[PDB]
Scaffold this motif. Structure first.
Motif, PDB file in Angstrom:
ATOM      1  N   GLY A  83       0.818  -1.201   0.000  1.00  0.00           N
ATOM      2  CA  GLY A  83       0.000   0.000   0.000  1.00  0.00           C
ATOM      3  C   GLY A  83       0.859   1.260   0.000  1.00  0.00           C
ATOM      4  N   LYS A  84       0.320   2.351   0.564  1.00  0.00           N
ATOM      5  CA  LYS A  84       0.952   3.666   0.565  1.00  0.00           C
ATOM      6  C   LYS A  84       1.143   4.209  -0.854  1.00  0.00           C
ATOM      7  CE  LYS A  84       1.768   2.688   4.945  1.00  0.00           C
ATOM      8  NZ  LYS A  84       0.746   3.144   5.912  1.00  0.00           N
ATOM      9  N   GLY A  85       0.273   3.818  -1.787  1.00  0.00           N
ATOM     10  CA  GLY A  85       0.288   4.349  -3.136  1.00  0.00           C
ATOM     11  C   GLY A  85       1.025   3.416  -4.086  1.00  0.00           C
ATOM     12  N   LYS A  86       0.757   3.604  -5.374  1.00  0.00           N
ATOM     13  CA  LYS A  86       1.354   2.779  -6.403  1.00  0.00           C
ATOM     14  C   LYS A  86       2.840   3.110  -6.484  1.00  0.00           C
ATOM     15  CE  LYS A  86       0.628   1.347 -11.174  1.00  0.00           C
ATOM     16  NZ  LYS A  86       0.372  -0.093 -10.943  1.00  0.00           N
ATOM     17  N   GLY A  87       3.656   2.107  -6.828  1.00  0.00           N
ATOM     18  CA  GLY A  87       5.095   2.285  -6.906  1.00  0.00           C
ATOM     19  C   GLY A  87       5.512   3.212  -8.050  1.00  0.00           C
ATOM     20  N   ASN A  88       6.826   3.432  -8.154  1.00  0.00           N
ATOM     21  CA  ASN A  88       7.411   4.365  -9.103  1.00  0.00           C
ATOM     22  C   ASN A  88       7.662   3.647 -10.424  1.00  0.00           C
ATOM     23  OD1 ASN A  88       9.369   4.950  -6.284  1.00  0.00           O
ATOM     24  ND2 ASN A  88       7.774   6.389  -6.932  1.00  0.00           N
ATOM     25  N   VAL A  89       7.569   4.371 -11.549  1.00  0.00           N
ATOM     26  CA  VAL A  89       7.847   3.797 -12.860  1.00  0.00           C
ATOM     27  C   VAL A  89       9.341   3.481 -12.947  1.00  0.00           C
ATOM     28  CG1 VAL A  89       7.790   4.147 -15.373  1.00  0.00           C
ATOM     29  CG2 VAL A  89       5.932   5.033 -13.956  1.00  0.00           C
ATOM     30  N   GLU A  90       9.676   2.229 -13.283  1.00  0.00           N
ATOM     31  CA  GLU A  90      11.060   1.778 -13.353  1.00  0.00           C
ATOM     32  C   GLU A  90      11.487   1.464 -14.785  1.00  0.00           C
ATOM     33  OE1 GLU A  90      13.377   1.829 -10.852  1.00  0.00           O
ATOM     34  OE2 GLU A  90      11.756   2.853  -9.766  1.00  0.00           O
ATOM     35  N   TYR A  91      10.590   0.896 -15.600  1.00  0.00           N
ATOM     36  CA  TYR A  91      10.939   0.544 -16.965  1.00  0.00           C
ATOM     37  C   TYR A  91       9.674   0.443 -17.808  1.00  0.00           C
ATOM     38  CZ  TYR A  91       9.864  -4.294 -15.409  1.00  0.00           C
ATOM     39  OH  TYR A  91       9.270  -5.419 -14.919  1.00  0.00           O
ATOM     40  N   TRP A  92       9.885   0.279 -19.118  1.00  0.00           N
ATOM     41  CA  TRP A  92       8.834   0.285 -20.113  1.00  0.00           C
ATOM     42  C   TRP A  92       8.834  -1.041 -20.858  1.00  0.00           C
ATOM     43  CZ3 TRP A  92       5.599   4.524 -20.766  1.00  0.00           C
ATOM     44  CH2 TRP A  92       5.928   5.642 -19.999  1.00  0.00           C
ATOM     45  N   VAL A  93       7.639  -1.552 -21.177  1.00  0.00           N
ATOM     46  CA  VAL A  93       7.525  -2.816 -21.880  1.00  0.00           C
ATOM     47  C   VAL A  93       6.578  -2.665 -23.058  1.00  0.00           C
ATOM     48  CG1 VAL A  93       7.981  -4.141 -19.781  1.00  0.00           C
ATOM     49  CG2 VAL A  93       5.615  -3.799 -20.505  1.00  0.00           C
ATOM     50  N   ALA A  94       6.738  -3.579 -24.021  1.00  0.00           N
ATOM     51  CA  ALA A  94       5.743  -3.864 -25.037  1.00  0.00           C
ATOM     52  C   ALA A  94       5.096  -5.201 -24.700  1.00  0.00           C
ATOM     53  CB  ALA A  94       6.400  -3.919 -26.393  1.00  0.00           C
ATOM     54  N   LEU A  95       3.758  -5.258 -24.725  1.00  0.00           N
ATOM     55  CA  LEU A  95       3.058  -6.524 -24.581  1.00  0.00           C
ATOM     56  C   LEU A  95       3.108  -7.262 -25.912  1.00  0.00           C
ATOM     57  CD1 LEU A  95      -0.043  -5.516 -22.426  1.00  0.00           C
ATOM     58  CD2 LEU A  95       2.178  -6.364 -21.697  1.00  0.00           C
ATOM     59  N   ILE A  96       3.472  -8.547 -25.857  1.00  0.00           N
ATOM     60  CA  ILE A  96       3.616  -9.375 -27.038  1.00  0.00           C
ATOM     61  C   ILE A  96       2.587 -10.493 -26.969  1.00  0.00           C
ATOM     62  CG2 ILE A  96       5.187 -10.811 -28.395  1.00  0.00           C
ATOM     63  CD1 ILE A  96       5.947  -7.758 -28.147  1.00  0.00           C
ATOM     64  N   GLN A  97       1.880 -10.699 -28.088  1.00  0.00           N
ATOM     65  CA  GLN A  97       0.993 -11.830 -28.260  1.00  0.00           C
ATOM     66  C   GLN A  97       1.561 -12.719 -29.359  1.00  0.00           C
ATOM     67  OE1 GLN A  97      -0.635  -8.518 -29.001  1.00  0.00           O
ATOM     68  NE2 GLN A  97      -0.265  -8.293 -26.807  1.00  0.00           N
ATOM     69  N   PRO A  98       1.203 -14.021 -29.394  1.00  0.00           N
ATOM     70  CA  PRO A  98       1.663 -14.910 -30.460  1.00  0.00           C
ATOM     71  C   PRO A  98       1.294 -14.369 -31.838  1.00  0.00           C
ATOM     72  CG  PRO A  98       0.713 -16.177 -28.678  1.00  0.00           C
ATOM     73  CD  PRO A  98       0.363 -14.727 -28.409  1.00  0.00           C
ATOM     74  N   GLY A  99       2.273 -14.379 -32.750  1.00  0.00           N
ATOM     75  CA  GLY A  99       2.079 -13.915 -34.111  1.00  0.00           C
ATOM     76  C   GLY A  99       2.689 -12.544 -34.383  1.00  0.00           C
ATOM     77  N   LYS A 100       3.070 -11.796 -33.339  1.00  0.00           N
ATOM     78  CA  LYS A 100       3.552 -10.434 -33.500  1.00  0.00           C
ATOM     79  C   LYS A 100       4.911 -10.450 -34.201  1.00  0.00           C
ATOM     80  CE  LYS A 100       2.777  -6.010 -32.380  1.00  0.00           C
ATOM     81  NZ  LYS A 100       1.422  -5.425 -32.540  1.00  0.00           N
ATOM     82  N   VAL A 101       5.018  -9.767 -35.352  1.00  0.00           N
ATOM     83  CA  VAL A 101       6.313  -9.531 -35.976  1.00  0.00           C
ATOM     84  C   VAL A 101       7.029  -8.471 -35.147  1.00  0.00           C
ATOM     85  CG1 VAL A 101       7.531  -8.764 -38.078  1.00  0.00           C
ATOM     86  CG2 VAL A 101       5.532 -10.245 -38.266  1.00  0.00           C
ATOM     87  N   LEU A 102       8.211  -8.815 -34.622  1.00  0.00           N
ATOM     88  CA  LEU A 102       8.944  -7.961 -33.704  1.00  0.00           C
ATOM     89  C   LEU A 102       9.911  -7.074 -34.473  1.00  0.00           C
ATOM     90  CD1 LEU A 102       9.758 -10.689 -31.037  1.00  0.00           C
ATOM     91  CD2 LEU A 102       7.828  -9.111 -31.081  1.00  0.00           C
ATOM     92  N   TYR A 103      10.655  -7.694 -35.396  1.00  0.00           N
ATOM     93  CA  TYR A 103      11.665  -7.003 -36.175  1.00  0.00           C
ATOM     94  C   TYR A 103      11.536  -7.424 -37.629  1.00  0.00           C
ATOM     95  CZ  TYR A 103      14.058  -6.451 -31.647  1.00  0.00           C
ATOM     96  OH  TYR A 103      14.382  -6.142 -30.365  1.00  0.00           O
ATOM     97  N   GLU A 104      11.923  -6.519 -38.530  1.00  0.00           N
ATOM     98  CA  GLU A 104      12.017  -6.851 -39.939  1.00  0.00           C
ATOM     99  C   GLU A 104      13.362  -6.388 -40.466  1.00  0.00           C
ATOM    100  OE1 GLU A 104       8.682  -5.730 -42.334  1.00  0.00           O
ATOM    101  OE2 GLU A 104       7.241  -6.256 -40.772  1.00  0.00           O
ATOM    102  N   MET A 105      13.781  -7.031 -41.554  1.00  0.00           N
ATOM    103  CA  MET A 105      15.066  -6.751 -42.162  1.00  0.00           C
ATOM    104  C   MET A 105      14.916  -6.831 -43.680  1.00  0.00           C
ATOM    105  SD  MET A 105      18.623  -8.647 -41.201  1.00  0.00           S
ATOM    106  CE  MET A 105      18.480  -8.253 -39.459  1.00  0.00           C
ATOM    107  N   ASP A 106      15.684  -5.990 -44.384  1.00  0.00           N
ATOM    108  CA  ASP A 106      15.733  -5.972 -45.839  1.00  0.00           C
ATOM    109  C   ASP A 106      17.173  -5.711 -46.269  1.00  0.00           C
ATOM    110  OD1 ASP A 106      13.815  -6.061 -48.184  1.00  0.00           O
ATOM    111  OD2 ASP A 106      14.830  -4.158 -48.655  1.00  0.00           O
TER     112      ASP A 106
END
Ligand code: P8F
Ligand code: P8F
Ligand code: K
Ligand code: K
Ligand code: K
Ligand code: K
Ligand code: K
Ligand code: K
Ligand code: K
Ligand code: K
Ligand code: K
Ligand code: K
Ligand code: K
Ligand code: K
Ligand code: MG
Ligand code: MG
Ligand code: MG
Ligand code: MG
Ligand code: MG
Ligand code: MG
Ligand code: MG
Ligand code: MG
Ligand code: MG
Ligand code: MG
Ligand code: MG
Ligand code: MG
Ligand code: MG
Ligand code: MG
Ligand code: MG
Ligand code: MG
Ligand code: MG
Ligand code: MG
Ligand code: MG
Ligand code: MG
Ligand code: MG
Ligand code: MG
Ligand code: MG
Ligand code: MG
Ligand code: MG
Ligand code: MG
Ligand code: MG
Ligand code: MG
Ligand code: MG
Ligand code: MG
Ligand code: MG
Ligand code: MG
Ligand code: MG
Ligand code: MG
Ligand code: MG
Ligand code: ZN
Lengths: 136, 94, 26, 38, 57, 78
Positions: A83-106
């Motif tokens: 308790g005593k309030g929500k914690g501090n922001v520490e890092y950032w994420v992307a939510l990934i589901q099956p099928g998501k193309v993460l990176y592409e290359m050409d």
RNA sequence: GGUUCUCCCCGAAAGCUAUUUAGGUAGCGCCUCGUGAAUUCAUCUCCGGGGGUAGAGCACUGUUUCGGCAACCCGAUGCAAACUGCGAAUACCGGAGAAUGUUAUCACGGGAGACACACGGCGGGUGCUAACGUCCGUCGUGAAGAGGGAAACAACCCAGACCGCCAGCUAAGGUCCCAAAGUCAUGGUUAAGUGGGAAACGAUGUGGGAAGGCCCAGACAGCGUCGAGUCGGCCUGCGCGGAAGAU
RNA sequence: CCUCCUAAAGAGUAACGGAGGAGCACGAAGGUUGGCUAAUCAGGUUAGUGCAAUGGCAUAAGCCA
RNA sequence: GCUCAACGGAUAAAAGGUACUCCGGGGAUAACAGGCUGAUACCGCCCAAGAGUUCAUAUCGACGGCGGUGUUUGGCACCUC
RNA sequence: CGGCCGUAGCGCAGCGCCGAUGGUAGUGUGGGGUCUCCCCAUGCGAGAGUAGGGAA
């Protein structure tokens, strides 16, 4: 290390991560690294994988990152109670589901793209697969 | 050129479609022209091999359904999100 | 425009008369 | 002997062999390439 | 025409609406068989608790 | 170790009180709302807080009407 | 803290609101007894309704990547509890109709108890999608519920004990011995005691499948010889390593 | 005390959960009649609303007499 | 005529100390130990940038990834006031 | 003057707008798994997009 430049709000509900991905096709490049598993990718993981694949191709061709870590994750410091309030922001994420193309290359041979993405995949907490662009 | 053998579907909807794909088939639809849409079931591995050829999407195809030969083009394909599989194909009469 | 401006001017009273169920001398 | 969870051929002279339920890499060229899964 | 409906499983732990449906059919206990008129309204009640009744028609 | 949040207001019990086809007495509140999410149709009044209420005994009727596709509530005198 | 004979019927709550209130108390909710009253109530079917949740989407509010023209703009790609040009299932309100139900409904009056809840499922906030954690919603069980199962095991699964029987059928769960019942039948798989603790990742373990490349113009391996297949990826079933703890 | 979200598309719904506001103003900024239409740099409300946020608002609830 | 704002407002009118202490209670609630958890800690592993003259893997292992232990710092408040 | 409220509006089919069929997502009830998430039976079934419609 990717991060929204600004956000409407600082902190976000945990939420859930159900469903299959949108953006399941190689849309920009010739080759892609696709998530088979479900999970969170941190900005640090995305960057570690990017650096690995970029070095492998010796800055030839072009790389797209299709995911962006826009979900802030909070943590409570050590030795603080609940308790005593929500914690501090520490890092950032992307939510990934099956099928998501993460990176592409050409602009590289397939063989080199496969090696580059193998080195990248070893940095990621989610199972991945190599994919190629399709006509339809 | 490309000869696809098909059967008319007996059942439709989610339950029937998932049962098809569990039995190594997949649903498809033929529409266009003026004749009503025809819901069909295809053998998965056969069509998956055919559509690896780039000319599957370009050239006119023949779907042999109930003996009848129907000439069509591939209009749209629904792929499985991460496995190398076909969920569904739209064929337009052409 | 003059017509559209006049139509706007007319609408409130016309909507009121319909509400009242009044026989209207336009 | 390298004792690792990931054992792999490190050169063309390396051979994978299973002995007594254990995956091993034996190499005729390089003794450093000898590995046991463990 | 009438249909015979038998309760096949317990009502213990079932949703309130399912217990209300068994009451609507007049089923009182496991193995209780009732004879009811074959109407859409009756068939809908059977459908609602189909997992714990069996129809003899 | 403290929060600057922790406030909220009392819930206002807005929303539809009498749905389509319900028979109402004159005076009956049909909907409480903020602004005119619903507009007053025939035999319905709009109060100062945008409450729609029956001006006649009858059945509540919801309708989409006019060039903006707006939601109107009427009483069908019954 | 303790509160002394018996049997029969019904049977809670651990919530809301307020409180110098928070382990107290009051009104309401839920129990009981009495009285009175409408097809009053419930289930299902059909009909009339409002939704902005799930999902989806990106015109809007923000965020995001690439390209074309560092802004705008155009094309392509995602993301959102406090985004919505879309939008379910359910739930809820109302109407009609059967059947069923010991009026199951509502009102008024006599008597309460209770306002420490617990776990489990589903939807969530918080926490580390940590806790047998914490806080809501909703259903179930325990509480206040015995019997059978899950070795043992309030809260899980099956199931609701009026009494008696050395009858019978079943549920979950089981049928080699402890220990009641198949050393049952047919077709497969596994060789790890896997089964009977298991992650990234590693590997000529082994079963199935769909394509392929090369092959009696002699492949593949080994040494032109040579004389049948050979090669390596994909998909899938079951196994293997990864695997260190204190009587 | 007010607004939004959490809140599971009726109402309601908790936490030392996530975000903001109020303890006024106004004899016109109220009533009514008549009229009128914004931001931005053609556009069409992207403005406006005495003060938060949400829902509204062109018949304007916005602007002028 | 009330910042009776502790906003259903104990009074018109009210701060502290106690290790000199005392009573009624509570494992409804902390300090020890146990328990659950394992963020943290400790240990192991995966990938291999690079260091190592040359050479990733003798030795070391950046950016990141996956576990094990119960083992530190903690969380919780289930047992015992 | 109305009904209607983009198939009806713009521009001069180029757009807006409408829009199947099929599939997909979700989901009530029952059941199951390797259970942060899914699957099976049954019922309901989008959104987007596709064919097409369309100059009321
Ligand atoms: C209580 N009961 C349902 C089971 C039980 O009776 C026993 C027993 N021996 O009789 C158990 O062991 C049990 O109590 C128990 O301890 C379990 C586990 O600990 C358990 C189990 C399965 C798991 C599967 C996956 C994972 C992965 N974890 C979750 C995340 F933290 C990573 C953990 C498991 C686990 O911890 C079996 C149950 C059975 C229990
Ligand atoms: C066989 N017996 C030792 C236990 C047992 O009797 C039961 C039971 N229900 O009666 C079990 O469930 C058991 O057989 C079993 O299956 C277990 C698990 O499945 C289990 C357990 C603990 C775990 C802890 C961690 C993890 C996850 N990590 C990452 C992975 F690499 C390991 C998994 C667990 C798990 O699967 C408990 C045992 C108890 C068994
Ligand atoms: K009313
Ligand atoms: K009370
Ligand atoms: K009473
Ligand atoms: K619950
Ligand atoms: K009970
Ligand atoms: K064993
Ligand atoms: K005035
Ligand atoms: K007070
Ligand atoms: K004192
Ligand atoms: K290890
Ligand atoms: K070396
Ligand atoms: K003690
Ligand atoms: Mg289904
Ligand atoms: Mg030996
Ligand atoms: Mg509110
Ligand atoms: Mg309108
Ligand atoms: Mg009783
Ligand atoms: Mg969503
Ligand atoms: Mg109390
Ligand atoms: Mg309480
Ligand atoms: Mg509770
Ligand atoms: Mg939960
Ligand atoms: Mg608890
Ligand atoms: Mg929990
Ligand atoms: Mg008690
Ligand atoms: Mg019991
Ligand atoms: Mg028992
Ligand atoms: Mg057990
Ligand atoms: Mg066991
Ligand atoms: Mg026992
Ligand atoms: Mg028997
Ligand atoms: Mg026996
Ligand atoms: Mg046998
Ligand atoms: Mg074992
Ligand atoms: Mg293993
Ligand atoms: Mg609501
Ligand atoms: Mg709801
Ligand atoms: Mg409540
Ligand atoms: Mg005015
Ligand atoms: Mg007070
Ligand atoms: Mg004492
Ligand atoms: Mg305690
Ligand atoms: Mg302790
Ligand atoms: Mg401890
Ligand atoms: Mg507690
Ligand atoms: Mg103890
Ligand atoms: Mg549609
Ligand atoms: Zn070697």
């Amino acid at each position: 290390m990717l991060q929204p430049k600004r956000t409407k709000f600082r902190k976000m509900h945990k939420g859930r991560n159900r469903g299959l991905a949108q953006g399941t096709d190689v849309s920009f490049g010739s080759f892609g690294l696709k998530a088979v598993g479900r999970g969170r990718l941190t900005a640090r993981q995305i960057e570690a994988a990017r650096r690995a694949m970029t070095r492998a191709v010796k800055r030839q061709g072009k790389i797209w990152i299709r995911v962006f870590p826009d979900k802030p994750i909070t943590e409570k410091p050590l030795a603080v109670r609940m308790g005593k309030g929500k914690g501090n922001v520490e890092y950032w994420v992307a939510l990934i589901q099956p099928g998501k193309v993460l990176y592409e290359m050409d602009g590289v041979p397939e063989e080199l793209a496969r090696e580059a993405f193998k080195l990248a995949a070893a940095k990621l907490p989610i199972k991945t697969t190599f994919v190629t662009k399709t006509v339809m | 050129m490309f000869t696809i053998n098909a059967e008319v579907r007996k059942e439709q909807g989610k339950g029937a479609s998932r049962r098809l794909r569990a039995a190594n088939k997949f649903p498809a639809i033929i529409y266009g022209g003026k004749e009503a849409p025809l819901a069909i079931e295809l053998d998965h591995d056969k069509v998956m091999n055919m559509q690896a050829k780039a000319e599957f999407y370009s050239e006119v195809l023949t779907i042999v359904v109930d003996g009848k030969e129907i000439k069509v083009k591939a209009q749209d394909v629904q792929r499985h999100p991460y496995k190398p599989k076909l969920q569904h194909i739209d064929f337009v009469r052409a | 425009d003059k017509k559209s401006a006049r139509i706007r001017r007319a609408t409130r009273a016309r909507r009121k008369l319909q509400e009242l169920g009044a026989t209207r001398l336009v | 002997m390298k004792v690792r969870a990931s054992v792999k051929k490190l050169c063309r002279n390396c051979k994978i062999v299973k002995r007594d339920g254990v995956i091993r890499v034996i190499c005729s060229a390089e003794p450093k390439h000898k590995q046991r899964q463990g | 025409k009438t249909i015979k409906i038998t309760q096949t499983r317990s009502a213990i732990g079932r949703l309130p609406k399912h217990k209300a449906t068994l009451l609507g059919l007049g089923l009182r206990r496991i193995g209780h068989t009732v004879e009811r008129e074959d109407t859409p309204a009756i068939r809908g009640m059977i459908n609602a608790v189909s997992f714990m009744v069996k129809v003899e028609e | 170790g403290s929060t600057r949040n922790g406030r909220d207001s009392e819930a206002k019990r807005l929303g539809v009180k009498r749905f389509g086809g319900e028979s109402v007495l004159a005076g009956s509140i049909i909907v409480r709302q903020r602004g005119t999410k619903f507009h007053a149709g025939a035999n319905v009044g709009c109060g100062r807080d945008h409450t729609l209420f029956a001006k006649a005994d009858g059945k509540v009727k919801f309708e989409v009407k006019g060039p903006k596709n707006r939601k109107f509530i009427s009483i069908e005198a019954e």
